[PDB]
Amino acid sequence: MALPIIVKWGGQEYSVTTLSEDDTVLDLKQFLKTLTGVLPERQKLLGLKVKGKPAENDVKLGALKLKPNTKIMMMGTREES
């Protein structure tokens, strides 16, 4: 099945529901980041790595073996528009 993930941008939390292990981390982040999060162009991932793994982007949701509640931090600024 799909693996949900929570993303916190600033002082709030947003649960992701649509991405699956069949996809990749970049597909989930770039997806939520487009909803309320901030693009990577300006912001950078804090804990891009987990469990010693790089979890850069080419990694699959189920490949990182991260929890569903796993929160994602994003440091940066929203687009200039």
Curated annotation (Swiss-Prot):
Outcome recorded upon mutating residue 49 to E: Loss of binding to PSMD2 and PSMC2, and loss of inhibitory effect on proteasome activity
Outcome recorded upon mutating residue 44 to A: Aberrant diffuse pan-cellular localization and loss of binding to PSMD2
Top-level taxonomic group: Eukaryota
Domain Ubiquitin-like, first and last residues per copy: 3-81
Function, in words: Dephosphorylates 26S nuclear proteasomes, thereby decreasing their proteolytic activity. Recruited to the 19S regulatory particle of the 26S proteasome through its interaction with 19S component PSMD2/RPN1. Once recruited, dephosphorylates 19S component PSMC2/RPT1 which impairs PSMC2 ATPase activity and disrupts 26S proteasome assembly. Has also been reported to stimulate the proteolytic activity of the 26S proteasome.
Free-text domain note: The Ubiquitin-like domain mediates interaction with proteasomes.
Record-given protein name: Ubiquitin-like domain-containing CTD phosphatase 1
Species for this entry: Homo sapiens (Human)
